[PDB]
Structure formats: structure tokens, C-alpha cells
């Protein structure tokens, strides 16, 4: 019922985006899932008048028997205007980061229930390729809000705010954050009785009419940081203090009142890498100054809603992983490492695919928005194998380090 | 009569801001217009194109063409001008059918949809960008015009319209017979399948009836198309593909051109015939692009001109897709960048062939290339079969596994066995992750001035070994990497070295065994002989003892 009216941005067309290649198993989970969004009347087949195309895939989601359509809108969301009459965008809620719970919900299927403005539905136009080309592509465009869009959580907002009014009233000390496809939900209560809210705030969507029943579930009060620390030891050897300088000299770029100097002084000489060096009285004050100035924060460290967050990873070995989220360089909004290895144990592109996940959540439930990462990786080993371990509805950006960091050794 | 289902028109557009073409008709010859009327009053009768009124402002230019060795014309006009402010479509032809891909079949016939082709309904709002003119005789008349009422053979639309129209009336067809398969190319519909061949000819015959609904005659005629199929480059048999004869000239003189279509016969041929090699020839066309350029053969591109020659002597085919088997993709290294591989199903019997070249940067080693080699061939492997095969690798799994733990990037290969066929990738060095107790410990430094490019490398150690050396037109990235290079030279087979050099510490953790770099390749060299080597690296200027000394000797 009653269309709103969706443009591009000025002077620019519709995406045209090369579907990539698809497993048999992924085009047989979609020309099965598309067959029925068709009967349902979310999707409509298209003519060769439609130039545009937009890439699909399918996933599994966390803990499911069953695919999930996802389209890749990144290219369409780019170019589509920004959303401005009744919304300004939405003042991010600084709590939802403090919560001890925040479950994740999928609410996209409610988009499919508001109709696409019938001038922009050729925009959404996706193809589901055949093997070895061998039939034409099946092409299909929304006749709905599809799940993914940067235009359906605007356009829905209205309806979405209706459904969840009772639950808000009824529960006042809960954030419910959206972002995309995803409903983020905390709470400060315990787990049980966390869950069965969350269940409570299920049943208010499905009496509306209508992969809901899913969770999953965030501990942010949990996360935890990375300050920078130096090692405690009894004996340093030369290498020892060489490395103890080098991570200095990288700190002072960060913390500026970092001193070197007397800790360098030691190494005067040209001694054995392995040999034992007493420390000086003069070092073991500046270390001890230095230690001191490395438990503070960094000077002026703000966020800037206008700029884009910037997610870096270090690959430290042995299913260990580093990450920095910052906007401009040395001022860091947050660090990390994930140890933690839910299989992936004999593959490194499956445990970066799992990283690039776990900070844009992160990113979204702090920020509201997704960082443009750079990633450890050739481009090509990436663009092959990234889709084959995705589980999130949306996509970051990404581009590709290929020259080692030096810097890897101090966030070690 | 019996009623038929009219095809529903494509809405079409030209491109925003843009009107239709108008361009003027070219003077004719008496005959050549008298031609054009004979034409247009034919096509005219059948509806393909109707007369209009002046008010209608476009306008397209018309030629007429010889038949060459006959006396007949036909008519061409020229859509140049409305091809340029007409839409873009869907292009569905790109994406072209791997022969590799596809499966063996018992019968292929071939049906003649030739008169659909001409056929087809054009969107009645945009038939007045399609006006032309036949000019008058003697010009002293108005030119007769007309408008196309279907889609005008050369313009822009019309292979995406037709094809989009012709996969519509099809689908139901296909859909409800599973047991053949079904293809258009120009104006056949070839027809494939298992069955007996009563059956066959059956589906053959309900196809037509299926095609009569729409009042679309084939010819009751026996096609002149069999098997085996002169298609895109290939020839398809009904168990076997390859590609078509490729012969190589014999020339004592060859030119850039003949090269470029040397390279592109070798290219094509790599899909089938295994171990076709064109780094050597490829090369000869290096900058330069003045074509008619005669270029001698180097030795190694007359050498790898002749191993092709072998390869090529008698003919290769490739077997179809069975579903019901492992994909499987074998890999050879066969030296300078360059790699060769099989993918088949059973022994001896390849599907397709291949080749990946080296990319272009300062410094590579063959585990990197063979990881490339494996993403290119699962990719194409997923457009073909919609599988990643299991690979065979000329690496063992300790070398695979030693190499990805300790790189410094995510890196991953899918299932693979190692096979045993040299020449074996390998790591040719690996650096220690501790320094080395009893090791001598050489502190290393370089250092150039920039316009005289007059520098010094060298080193001093633990046990007092020094080495300043004078260097002329050089750099400080070259010093540093001289300096690095002289402690290896001078000290024993387990080495500490300290450098200050951060470029220098780039190329060696991305663990290069060949570089375009002279230097890189005597370091690899060096570091290959040793038996332990730990590389430790340390901010320049800090007052870093052994690492201030050199610097400052080095810097003059
Ligand atoms: C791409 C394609 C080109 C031609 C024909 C193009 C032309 N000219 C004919 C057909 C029927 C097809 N389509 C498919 C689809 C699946 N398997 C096959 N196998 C197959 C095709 C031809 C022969 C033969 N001989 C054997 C096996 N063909
Ligand atoms: N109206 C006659 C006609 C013209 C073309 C046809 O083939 C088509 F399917 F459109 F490609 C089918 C029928
Ligand atoms: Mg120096």
C-alpha cells in the first residue's frame, strides 16, 4: 500500500555488476527460493530492456539447514540518494554498546510486505546464471522491499516503529537498535530471561502478519581491548632490548612524550643478538616512564560521523588475529585480537573471513555504520573462496594489503 | 485459419536527453533504387515494414549490396546513428557454453527458425526512429518512406530482443521435456538428447508443433546441419569436442602481426592440447605496436616454438561433463612463470587443458604462483562445471603447510593431493623466529648521496669483522640491500644480521625465490646456502650500537 518515491543520486544510472560465478548447489538454492518468491509476488521476471544487474549469492546462515538469499546491493546502495524527508538518520544509541546481552535478530522478511516504487524496481534487477551458460539467465526484479537495500530499513521505519511500540512502553530499559536486515536488541537481565524477551519481541512481529526465530547473541560489555604493554623480564638480551626500542620508537607516533634514549645507549657496542645486558639505572627509569604513559589514553581521539571507519588485520599466527578500527592513523577508536577458533583451524582465508565478520558487527553495534577494511590477502585468493564462509546479511567494503606490515610484530 | 499467439513486445527506449536519428540519405544509382523499391514493396507485403507519412522527421541511410557473382540486391541500412542514442539491453550472448561443459549426446538436430528471425514485433512507440528513405528516381518526386514494424536486422536491440522473445516461447517446452537440451544460435534451435531415436524424433516433431502455436514454420526438410558442428572456434562431435585445425606457418621472417596471431593459435589451442608454451614468443611483442615490424627469434622463442610444433603434430579432443564423476585438475611447473594443467575425469582422458602465466611485479616465488594458478583454475572450473575439482599438486604437504602457517598473509588452497612430478615446488629458505645462540651477529648499513649517486654498504660484527665497500651509481634502497648482502657473503652458515632497512625487510618477508632485482636474486642466492639466518631489523638514528657504527662508516 502506498509507494515512496526512491531516486538515484544525480547523474548516475542504475548498477551494472557481473554476476560471479555459482556452485551448483548455490543456483539450485536460488532458482528454488526465487520459483517461490515469484508465486508470492516479492519478485517478477524481467525483458532485455532492463540493462542493470545487481549480484546474488546464497548462504547458510549461523546453526540452519537452509539458504539464504543475499544480494550484493553495495553497488546499488552507493547509488541511491541518501534518506532525508522524514529522516535525518537516527541519533546512534551510545547505550546498545554498554548492554550486557544484545541479540541479533534477521527482520528482513518484514520489508517484503511494503510494495517498491514501481520507477525504481528495475534498479534491483539480479540474474541467477546456469551452468556453463548453457540456458539463458533467469532475470528477476523486486516488486518489494528487498533485504539488503540501504532504502528498505528507511522506508520501513514507519511501519517497524507501529510494531514495536508495545514492546518499547512494556520494556523501557531496552535498546532496540536496527541496522540493515538486522534488529539489535540488548539487555542487561539475565541470559534466561533474556532470551525469553527476546522471544516475547518475536511474537509481536509474527502476529503482524507474517529465519526470525534465530539469535545470536553479543556479550559487548565483555569486549575488550588492547592497550599497548611491555614486556616484564628479568634478563634482556640484546634482541630483546632491539625489539623493546623498535616497539618504543613505533608507541612515540602514538604517545608522543615516549623517550629511547637511554634504553639505545645500552645498546652501544656491537654486541652478540643473544648476549645479556644488564639494564642501567637511567633505563630502567625511562622504561618505567614509559610504561607509565602507555596506560593512558591517546590525545585527542574523537570519532567524526562524516568520515570512513577504517578496519585494519594482522594475521599473528597459530588462528590468532589482530584488527584496528580508526579514522585517521595512530588515533585509534578501538583495537582487538580474536583467538578463539570455531573450526577454520586448517584454513586462514576462513578464520579472515570470520574476523572481517565479527568486527563489522562490532563496528555497527558502536558506530551504526561498517568499516572499509584492509585485508591481509592476495585479491584473487579473497574474490575466490570469501563467499564460501559468509553468514551476515550485509557487506562491507574492502581493499587488499599486499606489502607485509612491519608493525604486525607490535600488536603481537 | 487457427489462431496464433501474437509475441508480446519489448518497451524500448532511446537513451535519456536524446531524439532519434537524422541523417541524410546518400545519392543512389537508377538500379540500385529501382532495386530497393522491388524489396521494400515485398517486405512491405509480408508487414516487415510499412510506408508513413511526412511528418515523421527521422531518418536512416539505405544502401544497396551486390550478391557477388550474382545479379541480385539486397537492402542494408546503415542504424549506426540510432544504435548510438538507443538503450542499452541485457546481453545474454555473452557467456558463451565451454564445450568442456557440456555432456555427450546420442542425437543433435538442428532446426531452421529462420523465418522467426525476421519476424519478430518491434515496441509500436519507438518504429519512427526506424525511417528511412528510398530515394526518387531522378529526384523529382519525394523520396518513399518507410518504418520497420519487427526488429531490423543490424540494430541495436535486435539480437537482445529476439533472443529474449525465442527463450520465452521455449521455456515451457524445455521445462516440461527434462530429456533433451535446447540451444539458439542466429537463426537454428539445435535439439540434443539420449533418447532412442524414435523418441527423439518425436520430441523433434512436438517441438514444431510447440513452435506452430506462435505460427512459427520450420522446414519439414532434412537440415543440412549434422555433427559434427564448426562452432565459435570449436568442433563438437556427439562424444568428442576440440578445437579447429590449428596449423603454425613455417617463416624465415616473421613480423609483430604474424607473432600476435602465432600467440592468439597457441592461446587457443592451450584449452585442449597439453603444455602449449607462449612466454618466449610473447615476449617479442614488448613495447614497440608498428606492425608491420619484422622482429628475429630469439633461440629460446625458436625453442619454444618448436616444442609447440610437437604438441600440435596429430590431432587432440577433449571428452564431455558427466555429472556423476570427480572433477579432477592436475598442475606442472614448466619454468619462467609459465604452468600447464589437465582437468579430467578419468585417467588419460582430459576434458579441457590449460596454461596460467606469472603476473608482473619485482619479486614472486613459485608457492605464490602456484596459489594463482589454483584460484584461476577453480574459478573457471566454477563457471564450467559449477565445481572446484580436486587438485594434484607438485607440492608436498609439509612444504604447503610449513609455507601458509608462517606467511605473513591469509592464504588457502581447496582439497589437493601431492603428486609426485618434477619439477617439485618447494621453499628454498626459511628465516629463524629467534636470533641464534653462537651465531656471529653482523650489523649491516648503506648509504648513498643522491645526486652523485657515490654510496657505501657494509657491516661490522660481534667479533670485529668489518666490510665498508665504495659503491658508485647507486641508491640508498640499493646500499641497504648491498649491505645485507655482504653479511651473508662474508659469515658462516648460521647468521644474526641487523638492519635499519624497512625496504629491505618488505622484499625479504614476502619470501621472494626470484626477482627482476639483480641484488634480490644474489641475496636469494646467498640465503639459499645457508643453514640458519634470523633477520632482525631496528629503527635507523636511535644510537643502536653496531648499527650507529656502520651507519656512520657508511656514510662517508
Ligand atoms: C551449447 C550448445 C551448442 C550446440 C551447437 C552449436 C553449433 N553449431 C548445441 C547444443 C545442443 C548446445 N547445448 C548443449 C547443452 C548441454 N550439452 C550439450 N552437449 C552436446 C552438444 C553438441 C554435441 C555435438 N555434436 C554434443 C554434445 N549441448
Ligand atoms: N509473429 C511471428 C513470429 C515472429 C518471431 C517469432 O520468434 C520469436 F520468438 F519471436 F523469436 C515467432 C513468431
Ligand atoms: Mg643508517
Given at each position: 500500500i502506498?509507494?515512496v518515491?526512491?531516486?538515484?543520486?544525480?547523474?548516475?544510472?542504475?548498477?551494472?555488476?557481473?554476476?560471479?560465478?555459482?556452485?551448483?548447489?548455490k543456483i539450485?538454492?536460488?532458482?528454488?527460493?526465487?520459483?517461490?518468491?515469484?508465486?508470492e509476488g516479492?519478485?517478477?521476471?524481467?525483458?532485455?530492456?532492463?540493462?542493470?544487474?545487481?549480484?546474488?549469492?546464497?548462504?547458510?546462515?549461523?546453526?540452519?539447514?537452509?539458504?539464504?538469499?543475499?544480494?550484493?546491493?553495495?553497488?546499488?546502495?552507493?547509488?541511491?540518494?541518501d534518506?532525508w524527508?522524514?529522516?535525518?538518520?537516527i541519533?546512534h544509541?551510545?547505550?546498545?554498546?554498554?548492554?550486557?546481552?544484545?541479540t541479533?535478530?534477521?527482520?528482513?522478511?518484514?520489508?517484503?510486505?511494503?510494495?517498491?516504487?514501481?520507477?525504481?524496481?528495475?534498479?534491483?534487477?539480479?540474474?541467477?546464471?546456469?551452468?556453463?551458460?548453457?540456458?539463458?539467465?533467469?532475470?528477476?526484479?523486486?516488486?518489494?522491499?528487498?533485504?539488503?537495500?540501504?532504502?528498505?530499513?528507511?522506508?520501513?521505519?514507519?511501519?517497524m516503529?507501529?510494531?514495536?511500540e508495545?514492546?518499547?512502553?512494556?520494556?523501557?530499559?531496552?535498546?532496540?537498535?536496527?541496522?540493515?536486515?538486522?534488529?539489535?536488541?540488548?539487555?542487561?537481565?539475565?541470559?534466561?530471561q533474556?532470551?525469553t524477551?527476546?522471544?516475547?519481541?518475536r511474537?509481536?512481529?509474527?502476529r503482524?502478519?507474517?529465519?526470525?526465530?534465530?539469535?545470536?547473541?553479543?556479550?559487548?560489555?565483555?569486549?575488550?581491548?588492547?592497550?599497548?604493554?611491555?614486556?616484564?623480564?628479568?634478563?634482556?638480551?640484546?634482541?630483546?632490548?632491539?625489539?623493546?626500542?623498535?616497539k618504543?620508537?613505533?608507541?612515540?607516533?602514538?604517545?608522543?612524550?615516549?623517550?629511547?634514549?637511554?634504553?639505545?645507549?645500552?645498546?652501544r657496542?656491537?654486541?652478540?643478538?643473544?648476549?645479556?645486558?644488564?639494564?642501567?639505572?637511567?633505563?630502567?627509569?625511562?622504561?618505567?616512564?614509559?610504561?607509565?604513559?602507555?596506560?593512558?589514553?591517546?590525545?585527542?581521539?574523537?570519532?567524526?560521523?562524516?568520515?570512513?571507519l577504517?578496519?585494519?588485520?594482522?594475521?599473528?599466527?597459530?588462528?590468532?588475529?589482530?584488527?584496528?578500527?580508526?579514522?585517521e592513523?595512530?588515533?585509534?577508536?578501538?583495537?582487538?585480537?580474536?583467538?578463539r577458533?570455531?573450526?577454520?583451524?586448517?584454513?586462514?582465508?576462513?578464520?579472515?573471513?570470520?574476523?572481517?565478520?565479527?568486527?563489522?558487527?562490532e563496528?555497527?553495534?558502536?558506530?551504526?555504520?561498517?568499516?572499509?577494511?584492509?585485508?591481509?590477502?592476495?585479491?584473487?585468493?579473497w574474490?575466490?573462496?570469501?563467499?564460501?564462509?559468509?553468514?551476515?546479511?550485509?557487506?562491507?567494503?574492502?581493499?587488499?594489503?599486499?606489502?607485509?606490515?612491519?608493525?604486525?610484530?607490535?600488536?603481537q | 485459419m487457427?489462431?496464433?499467439?501474437?509475441?508480446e513486445?519489448?518497451?524500448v527506449?532511446?537513451?535519456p536527453?536524446?531524439?532519434?536519428?537524422?541523417?541524410?540519405?546518400?545519392?543512389?544509382?537508377?538500379?540500385?533504387?529501382?532495386?530497393?523499391?522491388?524489396?521494400?514493396?515485398?517486405?512491405?507485403?509480408?508487414?516487415?515494414?510499412?510506408?508513413?507519412?511526412p511528418?515523421?522527421?527521422?531518418?536512416?541511410?539505405?544502401?544497396?549490396?551486390?550478391?557477388?557473382?550474382?545479379?541480385?540486391?539486397?537492402?542494408?541500412?546503415?542504424?549506426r546513428?540510432?544504435?548510438?542514442?538507443?538503450?542499452?539491453?541485457?546481453?545474454?550472448?555473452?557467456?558463451?557454453?565451454?564445450?568442456?561443459?557440456?555432456?555427450?549426446?546420442?542425437?543433435?538436430?538442428?532446426?531452421?527458425?529462420?523465418?522467426?528471425?525476421?519476424?519478430?514485433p518491434?515496441?509500436?512507440?519507438?518504429?519512427?526512429?526506424?525511417?528511412?528513405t528510398?530515394?526518387?528516381?531522378?529526384?523529382?518526386?519525394?523520396?518513399?518512406?518507410?518504418?520497420?514494424?519487427?526488429?531490423?536486422?543490424g540494430?541495436?536491440?535486435?539480437?537482445?530482443?529476439?533472443?529474449?522473445?525465442?527463450?520465452?516461447?521455449?521455456?515451457?517446452?524445455?521445462?516440461?521435456?527434462?530429456?533433451?537440451?535446447?540451444?539458439?544460435?542466429?537463426?537454428?534451435?539445435?535439439?540434443?538428447?539420449?533418447?532412442?531415436?524414435?523418441?527423439?524424433?518425436?520430441?523433434?516433431?512436438?517441438?514444431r508443433?510447440?513452435?506452430?502455436?506462435?505460427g512459427?514454420?520450420?522446414?519439414?526438410?532434412?537440415?543440412?546441419?549434422?555433427?559434427?558442428?564448426?562452432?565459435?572456434?570449436?568442433?563438437?562431435?556427439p562424444?568428442?569436442?576440440?578445437?579447429?585445425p590449428?596449423?603454425?606457418?613455417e617463416?624465415?621472417?616473421?613480423?609483430?602481426?604474424?607473432?600476435?596471431?602465432?600467440?592468439?593459435?597457441?592461446?587457443?589451442?592451450?584449452?585442449?592440447?597439453?603444455?602449449?608454451?607462449?612466454r618466449?614468443?610473447?615476449?617479442?611483442?614488448?613495447?614497440?605496436?608498428?606492425?608491420?615490424?619484422?622482429?628475429?627469434?630469439?633461440?629460446?622463442?625458436?625453442?619454444?616454438?618448436?616444442?609447440?610444433?610437437?604438441?600440435?603434430?596429430?590431432?587432440?579432443?577433449?571428452?564431455?561433463?558427466?555429472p556423476?564423476?570427480?572433477?579432477?585438475?592436475?598442475?606442472?611447473?614448466?619454468?619462467?612463470?609459465?604452468?600447464?594443467?589437465?582437468?579430467?575425469?578419468?585417467?588419460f582422458?582430459?576434458?579441457?587443458?590449460?596454461?596460467?602465466?606469472?603476473?608482473?611485479?619485482?619479486?614472486?616465488?613459485?608457492?605464490?604462483?602456484?596459489?594463482?594458478?589454483v584460484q584461476?583454475?577453480?574459478?573457471?572450473?566454477?563457471?564450467?562445471?559449477?565445481?572446484?575439482?580436486?587438485?594434484?599438486?607438485?607440492?608436498?604437504?609439509?612444504?604447503?603447510?610449513?609455507?601458509?602457517?608462517?606467511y605473513?598473509?591469509?592464504?588457502?588452497?581447496?582439497?589437493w593431493?601431492?603428486?609426485?612430478?618434477?619439477?617439485?615446488?618447494?621453499?628454498?629458505?626459511?628465516?629463524?623466529?629467534?636470533?641464534?645462540?653462537?651465531?656471529?651477529?653482523?650489523?649491516?648499513?648503506?648509504?648513498?648521496?643522491?645526486?652523485?649517486?657515490?654510496?657505501?654498504?657494509?657491516?661490522?660484527?660481534?667479533?670485529?669483522?668489518?666490510?665498508?665497500v665504495?659503491?658508485?651509481?647507486?641508491?640508498?634502497?640499493?646500499?641497504?640491500?648491498?649491505?645485507?648482502?655482504?653479511?651473508?657473503?662474508?659469515?658462516?652458515?648460521?647468521?644474526?644480521?641487523?638492519?635499519?632497512?624497512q625496504?629491505a625487510?618488505?622484499?625479504?618477508?614476502?619470501?621472494?625465490?626470484?626477482?627482476?632485482?639483480?641484488?634480490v636474486?644474489?641475496?636469494?642466492?646467498?640465503?639459499?646456502?645457508?643453514?640458519?639466518?634470523?633477520?632482525?631489523?631496528?629503527?635507523?638514528?636511535?644510537?643502536?650500537?653496531?648499527?650507529?657504527?656502520?651507519?656512520?662508516?657508511?656514510?662517508?
Amino acid at each position: 500500500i502506498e509507494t515512496v518515491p526512491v531516486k538515484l543520486k544525480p547523474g548516475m544510472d542504475g548498477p551494472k555488476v557481473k554476476q560471479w560465478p555459482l556452485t551448483e548447489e548455490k543456483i539450485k538454492a536460488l532458482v528454488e527460493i526465487c520459483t517461490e518468491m515469484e508465486k508470492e509476488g516479492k519478485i517478477s521476471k524481467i525483458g532485455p530492456e532492463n540493462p542493470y544487474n545487481t549480484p546474488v549469492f546464497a548462504i547458510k546462515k549461523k546453526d540452519s539447514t537452509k539458504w539464504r538469499k543475499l544480494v550484493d546491493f553495495r553497488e546499488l546502495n552507493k547509488r541511491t540518494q541518501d534518506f532525508w524527508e522524514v529522516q535525518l538518520g537516527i541519533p546512534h544509541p551510545a547505550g546498545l554498546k554498554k548492554k550486557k546481552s544484545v541479540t541479533v535478530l534477521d527482520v528482513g522478511d518484514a520489508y517484503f510486505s511494503v510494495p517498491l516504487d514501481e520507477d525504481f524496481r528495475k534498479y534491483t534487477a539480479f540474474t541467477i546464471p546456469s551452468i556453463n551458460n548453457e540456458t539463458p539467465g533467469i532475470r528477476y526484479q523486486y516488486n518489494v522491499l528487498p533485504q539488503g537495500w540501504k532504502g528498505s530499513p528507511a522506508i520501513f521505519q514507519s511501519s517497524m516503529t507501529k510494531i514495536l511500540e508495545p514492546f518499547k512502553k512494556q520494556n523501557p530499559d531496552i535498546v532496540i537498535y536496527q541496522y540493515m536486515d538486522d534488529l539489535y536488541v540488548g539487555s542487561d537481565l539475565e541470559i534466561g530471561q533474556h532470551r525469553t524477551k527476546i522471544e516475547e519481541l518475536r511474537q509481536h512481529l509474527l502476529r503482524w502478519g507474517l529465519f526470525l526465530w534465530m539469535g545470536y547473541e553479543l556479550h559487548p560489555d565483555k569486549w575488550t581491548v588492547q592497550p599497548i604493554v611491555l614486556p616484564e623480564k628479568d634478563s634482556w638480551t640484546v634482541n630483546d632490548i632491539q625489539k623493546l626500542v623498535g616497539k618504543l620508537n613505533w608507541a612515540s607516533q602514538i604517545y608522543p612524550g615516549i623517550k629511547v634514549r637511554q634504553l639505545s645507549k645500552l645498546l652501544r657496542g656491537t654486541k652478540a643478538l643473544t648476549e645479556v645486558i644488564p639494564l642501567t639505572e637511567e633505563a630502567e627509569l625511562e622504561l618505567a616512564e614509559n610504561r607509565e604513559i602507555l596506560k593512558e589514553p591517546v590525545h585527542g581521539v574523537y570519532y567524526d560521523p562524516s568520515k570512513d571507519l577504517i578496519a585494519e588485520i594482522q594475521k599473528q599466527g597459530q588462528g590468532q588475529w589482530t584488527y584496528q578500527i580508526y579514522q585517521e592513523p595512530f588515533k585509534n577508536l578501538k583495537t582487538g585480537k580474536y583467538a578463539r577458533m570455531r573450526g577454520a583451524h586448517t584454513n586462514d582465508v576462513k578464520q579472515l573471513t570470520e574476523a572481517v565478520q565479527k568486527i563489522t558487527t562490532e563496528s555497527i553495534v558502536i558506530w551504526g555504520k561498517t568499516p572499509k577494511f584492509k585485508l591481509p590477502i592476495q585479491k584473487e585468493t579473497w574474490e575466490t573462496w570469501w563467499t564460501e564462509y559468509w553468514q551476515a546479511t550485509w557487506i562491507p567494503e574492502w581493499e587488499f594489503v599486499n606489502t607485509p606490515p612491519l608493525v604486525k610484530l607490535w600488536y603481537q | 485459419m487457427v489462431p496464433i499467439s501474437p509475441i508480446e513486445t519489448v518497451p524500448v527506449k532511446l537513451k535519456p536527453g536524446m531524439d532519434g536519428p537524422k541523417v541524410k540519405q546518400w545519392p543512389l544509382t537508377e538500379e540500385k533504387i529501382k532495386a530497393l523499391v522491388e524489396i521494400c514493396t515485398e517486405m512491405e507485403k509480408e508487414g516487415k515494414i510499412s510506408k508513413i507519412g511526412p511528418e515523421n522527421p527521422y531518418n536512416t541511410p539505405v544502401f544497396a549490396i551486390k550478391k557477388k557473382d550474382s545479379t541480385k540486391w539486397r537492402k542494408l541500412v546503415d542504424f549506426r546513428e540510432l544504435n548510438k542514442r538507443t538503450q542499452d539491453f541485457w546481453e545474454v550472448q555473452l557467456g558463451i557454453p565451454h564445450p568442456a561443459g557440456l555432456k555427450k549426446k546420442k542425437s543433435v538436430t538442428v532446426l531452421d527458425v529462420g523465418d522467426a528471425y525476421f519476424s519478430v514485433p518491434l515496441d509500436e512507440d519507438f518504429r519512427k526512429y526506424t525511417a528511412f528513405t528510398i530515394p526518387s528516381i531522378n529526384n523529382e518526386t519525394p523520396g518513399i518512406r518507410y518504418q520497420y514494424n519487427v526488429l531490423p536486422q543490424g540494430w541495436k536491440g535486435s539480437p537482445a530482443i529476439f533472443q529474449s522473445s525465442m527463450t520465452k516461447i521455449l521455456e515451457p517446452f524445455a521445462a516440461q521435456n527434462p530429456d533433451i537440451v535446447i540451444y539458439q544460435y542466429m537463426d537454428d534451435l539445435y535439439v540434443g538428447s539420449d533418447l532412442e531415436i524414435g523418441q527423439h524424433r518425436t520430441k523433434i516433431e512436438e517441438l514444431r508443433q510447440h513452435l506452430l502455436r506462435w505460427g512459427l514454420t520450420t522446414p519439414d526438410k532434412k537440415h543440412q546441419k549434422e555433427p559434427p558442428f564448426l562452432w565459435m572456434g570449436y568442433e563438437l562431435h556427439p562424444d568428442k569436442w576440440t578445437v579447429q585445425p590449428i596449423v603454425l606457418p613455417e617463416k624465415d621472417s616473421w613480423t609483430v602481426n604474424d607473432i600476435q596471431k602465432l600467440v592468439g593459435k597457441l592461446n587457443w589451442a592451450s584449452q585442449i592440447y597439453p603444455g602449449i608454451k607462449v612466454r618466449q614468443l610473447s615476449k617479442l611483442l614488448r613495447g614497440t605496436k608498428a606492425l608491420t615490424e619484422v622482429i628475429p627469434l630469439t633461440e629460446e622463442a625458436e625453442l619454444e616454438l618448436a616444442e609447440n610444433r610437437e604438441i600440435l603434430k596429430e590431432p587432440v579432443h577433449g571428452v564431455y561433463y558427466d555429472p556423476s564423476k570427480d572433477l579432477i585438475a592436475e598442475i606442472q611447473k614448466q619454468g619462467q612463470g609459465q604452468w600447464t594443467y589437465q582437468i579430467y575425469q578419468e585417467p588419460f582422458k582430459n576434458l579441457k587443458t590449460g596454461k596460467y602465466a606469472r603476473m608482473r611485479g619485482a619479486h614472486t616465488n613459485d608457492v605464490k604462483q602456484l596459489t594463482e594458478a589454483v584460484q584461476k583454475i577453480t574459478t573457471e572450473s566454477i563457471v564450467i562445471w559449477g565445481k572446484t575439482p580436486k587438485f594434484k599438486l607438485p607440492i608436498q604437504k609439509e612444504t604447503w603447510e610449513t609455507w601458509w602457517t608462517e606467511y605473513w598473509q591469509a592464504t588457502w588452497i581447496p582439497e589437493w593431493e601431492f603428486v609426485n612430478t618434477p619439477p617439485l615446488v618447494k621453499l628454498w629458505y626459511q628465516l629463524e623466529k629467534e636470533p641464534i645462540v653462537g651465531a656471529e651477529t653482523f650489523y649491516v648499513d648503506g648509504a648513498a648521496n643522491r645526486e652523485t649517486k657515490l654510496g657505501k654498504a657494509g657491516y661490522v660484527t660481534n667479533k670485529g669483522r668489518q666490510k665498508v665497500v665504495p659503491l658508485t651509481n647507486t641508491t640508498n634502497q640499493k646500499t641497504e640491500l648491498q649491505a645485507i648482502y655482504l653479511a651473508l657473503q662474508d659469515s658462516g652458515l648460521e647468521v644474526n644480521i641487523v638492519t635499519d632497512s624497512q625496504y629491505a625487510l618488505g622484499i625479504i618477508q614476502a619470501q621472494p625465490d626470484k626477482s627482476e632485482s639483480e641484488l634480490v636474486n644474489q641475496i636469494i642466492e646467498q640465503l639459499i646456502k645457508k643453514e640458519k639466518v634470523y633477520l632482525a631489523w631496528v629503527p635507523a638514528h636511535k644510537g643502536i650500537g653496531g648499527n650507529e657504527q656502520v651507519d656512520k662508516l657508511v656514510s662517508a
